[PDB]
Every structure is written in C-alpha cells, then in structure tokens.
Amino acid sequence: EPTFVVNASLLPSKVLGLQVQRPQSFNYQPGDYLFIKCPGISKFEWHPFTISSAPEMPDVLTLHIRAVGSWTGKLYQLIREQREEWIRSGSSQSLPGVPVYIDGPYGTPSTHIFESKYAILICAGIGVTPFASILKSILHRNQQNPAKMPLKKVHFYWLNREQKAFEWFVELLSKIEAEDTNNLFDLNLYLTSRTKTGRPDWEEIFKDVAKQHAPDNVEVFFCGPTGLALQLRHLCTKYGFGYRKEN
Ligand SMILES: Cc1cc2nc3c(=O)[nH]c(=O)nc-3n(C[C@H](O)[C@H](O)[C@H](O)COP(=O)(O)OP(=O)(O)OC[C@H]3O[C@@H](n4cnc5c(N)ncnc54)[C@H](O)[C@@H]3O)c2cc1C
Numbered sequence: 001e002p003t004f005v006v007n008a009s010l011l012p013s014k015v016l017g018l019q020v021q022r023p024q025s026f027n028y029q030p031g032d033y034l035f036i037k038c039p040g041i042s043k044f045e046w047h048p049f050t051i052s053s054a055p056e057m058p059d060v061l062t063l064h065i066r067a068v069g070s071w072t073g074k075l076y077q078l079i080r081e082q083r084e085e086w087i088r089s090g091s092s093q094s095l096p097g098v099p100v101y102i103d104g105p106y107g108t109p110s111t112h113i114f115e116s117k118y119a120i121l122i123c124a125g126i127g128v129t130p131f132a133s134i135l136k137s138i139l140h141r142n143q144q145n146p147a148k149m150p151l152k153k154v155h156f157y158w159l160n161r162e163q164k165a166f167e168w169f170v171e172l173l174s175k176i177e178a179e180d181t182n183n184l185f186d187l188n189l190y191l192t193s194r195t196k197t198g199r200p201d202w203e204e205i206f207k208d209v210a211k212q213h214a215p216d217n218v219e220v221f222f223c224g225p226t227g228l229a230l231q232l233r234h235l236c237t238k239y240g241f242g243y244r245k246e247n
Pocket residue numbers: 033047048049050051064065066067068069070071072073129
C-alpha cells in the first residue's frame with residue numbers, strides 16, 4: 001500500500017506522466033486502474049487513474065494524469081514547483097519522493113483480448129489510458145513467446161478530436177509500430193504519423209477485417225460513446241463478430 005512518486009514528466013498540455021514504486025504485493029493486468037491518495041494535496045480524497053504501464057514493467061507504474069480540476073491541478077503544482085526547485089536550486093543529493101497511497105488493482109474485461117485470435121480495439125474519445133497499457137503487454141507477450149499467444153492480429157482504431165494532451169500516446173504508438181516485427185498490429189488513428197481526418201466508414205472497416213479473417217472469429221472491444229456503440233453492434237451482428245463495451 002504505502003509508496004512514492006519516483007519521477008515526473010511535464011508532458012504537454014499539463015499532462016503528468018508519473019513513476020510509482022510498484023509494491024511487491026501489487027500485481028495487475030493490462031488496462032487495470034487505480035485509486036490514489038496523495039496526502040500533500042488532499043489528506044482525504046482518493047482519485048482513480050488507469051495504469052499506463054504493462055505489468056511486464058518491473059518495479060514502477062506509470063500514470064499519465066491530466067490536470068483538469070482541483071486535485072489534479074494541485075497535483076501538477078506539487079510537481080512543477082517540486083521540480084522547478086531542483087533546477088534553479090539543484091541541491092542534487094538524490095531526488096526525494098512524493099508519498100502516495102494506492103488502492104487496487106481493479107479489473108477490466110481487457111484481459112480477454114489476450115485470449116482471442118483476432119481483435120478489434122476501438123477507442124473513441126480520451127479513454128486511451130488503458131489502451132496504452134494493453135498495447136505494450138501485447139508487444140511483450142508477442143516478443144517473449146508469440147506462439148504462446150492466441151492474439152494473432154490486433155486492429156486498433158483511435159478517434160480523438162485533438163491530441164495536444166495525447167502527444168505522449170502518439171509517440172507510444174509509433175514505438176509499437178517499430179518493434180512490431182511480426183506485423184501483429186494494424187493501428188489506425190482518426191482526427192475529429194500521417195493519420196486520417198473525419199469520421200471512419202465503419203461499414204467498410206468491418207467488411208474488410210471480416211475478409212481478412214474468414215472464416216475465423218473476430219472480437220470487438222469498444223471503449224467510447226453509446227450512439228457509436230449501437231452502430232458497431234449492428235456491424236458486429238452483420239459480420240458475426242463479437243462485441244463488448246469497456247466503460
Ligand atoms: C476508471 C477511471 C480512470 C481514469 N483515468 C484517468 C487517467 O488516466 N488520467 C486522468 O487524467 N484522469 C483519469 N481519470 C479521471 C480522474 O479520476 C479525475 O479527473 C480526478 O478525480 C481528477 O479530478 P479533480 O478533482 O482533480 O477535478 P474536478 O474538479 O473533479 O474536475 C472534474 C471535471 O469535470 C468538470 N466539471 C463537471 N461538473 C462541473 C461543474 N458543475 N462545474 C465545474 N466544472 C465541472 C471540471 O471542469 C473538470 O473537467 C479516470 C477516472 C476513472 C473513473
């Protein structure tokens with residue numbers, strides 16, 4: 001339970017990459033989320049974040065936080081000010097750590113992606129934190145033993161309207177396309193890396209992946225709004241795929 005924040009990242013758009021000492025009892029799956037208490041902001045509140053580090057990562061957890069309101073802004077400050085006083089001051093013995101409490105892990109149906117043969121992962125919006133975790137572990141599982149893993153093709157389609165806070169995620173995807181030696185991944189990005197503008201024609205993306213994998217079964221993992229959820233379930237049923245909604 002009791003731990004510390006062992007680094008930060010002042011990532012664009014006020015986003016806060018974080019490094020959290022992973023307790024020896026703390027073993028999580030990909031996409032799992034956390035409840036965190038930082039006493040120096042609130043002695044009382046807990047707040048929830050998805051872990052953005054595959055559980056293959058050894059002895060840290062990375063949390064990409066966005067300052068969007070009180071505790072997250074107060075959080076950002078206790079960092080920039082905690083960091084900016086090691087630059088115009090720089091008393092460099094070693095860095096200290098921000099004591100924080102953590103509660104979890106709490107699960108997601110994501111663990112089923114690793115069990116399925118083909119797979120459509122769709123993030124509409126900004127719930128992309130768990131998908132960064134997932135897509136890393138897929139990398140590691142593919143490397144360490146790609147025969148051991150049923151997941152043979154991952155189709156990733158991402159819809160955001162603006163990526164300023166998410167320039168960290170874009171990089172990470174490019175990395176995945178790099179070490180993706182086996183062409184396990186089909187990453188697509190759409191704006192609402194030369195990526196695609198406008199709404200995707202889902203009728204065709206599903207019609208295409210279908211042909212890619214006949215007569216095998218495909219599983220959809222949707223993570224977005226409900227009016228998109230409905231369109232896809234009708235496509236799932238029209239090509240006989242397999243649907244579930246995360247969050
Ligand atoms: C499962 C889960 C995973 C999450 N993962 C992440 C993650 O990876 N990264 C991350 O940054 N966050 C994540 N969050 C969100 C995070 O838990 C919250 O943003 C957190 O509580 C910080 O909120 P706050 O108290 O700092 O700001 P708040 O003051 O609570 O801000 C809440 C947001 O709603 C707005 N708002 C709503 N109603 C009003 C109103 N009446 N008046 C004014 N503003 C209003 C605020 O302006 C602000 O945008 C996650 C949440 C969940 C449930």
